[PDB]
Amino acid sequence: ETLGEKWKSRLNALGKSEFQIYKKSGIQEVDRTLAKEGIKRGETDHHAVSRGSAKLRWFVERNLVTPEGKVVDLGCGRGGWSYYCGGLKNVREVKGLTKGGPGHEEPIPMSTYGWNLVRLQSGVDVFFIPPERCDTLLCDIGESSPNPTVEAGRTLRVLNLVENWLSNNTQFCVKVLNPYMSSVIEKMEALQRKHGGALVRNPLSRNSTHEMYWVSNASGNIVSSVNMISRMLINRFTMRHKKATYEPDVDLGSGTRNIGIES
Numbered sequence: 001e002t003l004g005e006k007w008k009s010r011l012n013a014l015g016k017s018e019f020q021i022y023k024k025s026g027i028q029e030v031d032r033t034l035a036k037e038g039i040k041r042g043e044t045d046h047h048a049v050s051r052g053s054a055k056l057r058w059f060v061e062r063n064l065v066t067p068e069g070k071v072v073d074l075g076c077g078r079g080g081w082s083y084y085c086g087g088l089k090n091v092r093e094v095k096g097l098t099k100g101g102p103g104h105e106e107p108i109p110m111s112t113y114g115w116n117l118v119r120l121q122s123g124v125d126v127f128f129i130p131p132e133r134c135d136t137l138l139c140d141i142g143e144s145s146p147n148p149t150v151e152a153g154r155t156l157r158v159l160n161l162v163e164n165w166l167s168n169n170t171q172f173c174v175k176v177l178n179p180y181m182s183s184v185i186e187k188m189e190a191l192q193r194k195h196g197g198a199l200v201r202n203p204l205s206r207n208s209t210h211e212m213y214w215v216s217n218a219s220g221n222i223v224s225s226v227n228m229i230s231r232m233l234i235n236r237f238t239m240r241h242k243k244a245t246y247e248p249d250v251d252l253g254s255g256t257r258n259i260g261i262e263s
């Protein structure tokens, strides 16, 4: 087996209370109380709609993706990645497509900064629509499963989807749900030879997932980068000072493009 599969079965064997502790041990968290109370309150101004905005921020601050021009947000739920992109300097347009109806996250309308560049459509299944052209491609799709062979296919699906949307110079940040299964590893090698980039681990991800992000502006051997994260997660099984480290939430501004309080 892979180290990843080994991690997955060990994780799946944990007691209920032990699992809870492992999930958040030594990770980064976003401080979200006041932003969530505000949203529940009807406010539409400064708040990220999910912890997803801060998640994307991590990549963008480090130039692992540089969202520019026409941004397509494939599978965008409440819109966390989309609204975040709407407040960015080089972004002209943001199209977020999502399935979202019942049992799924419906797009929340917001008046955060650059909201007017942001078009969010529900009732759409991205897997069976034709690829529009774009400058930035984003996809955070991937529902995790205790069965890693289920995960591996979901990941392969998603990797096949984004492949169809990628032209020569697209900037991209695509979630790789389960990167440790060999069929996925293989697909990733093909894709990296084709489109470049590498897999990177986001400190805000929980220890209960092996997700890594294929981001356009990095490099590294695929296998080495996965095993690295496999080892880390395995190390964290036996960990001491357990509290997560917190981070303030993103402040997305308010109002229209230049006039207009920024983020």
Ligand SMILES: C[n+]1cn([C@@H]2O[C@H](COP(=O)(O)OP(=O)(O)OP(=O)(O)OC[C@H]3O[C@@H](n4cnc5c(=O)[nH]c(N)nc54)[C@H](O)[C@@H]3O)[C@@H](O)[C@H]2O)c2nc(N)[nH]c(=O)c21
Pocket: 011, 012, 013, 014, 015, 016, 019, 023, 143, 144, 145, 146, 147, 206, 208, 209
């Ligand atoms: C809850 N849970 C998950 N795993 C593992 O971590 C991954 C990410 O889950 P997650 O809940 O962190 O990610 P979500 O996307 O929120 O999953 P969400 O769909 O909201 O709900 C949790 C998922 O895990 C499953 N699950 C719930 N309770 C258990 C459990 O006690 N044991 C196992 N093996 N699976 C569980 C459940 O069927 C569902 O697919 C999962 O795919 C599991 O491998 C758990 N492992 C142990 N030992 N005990 C648990 O309580 C447990």
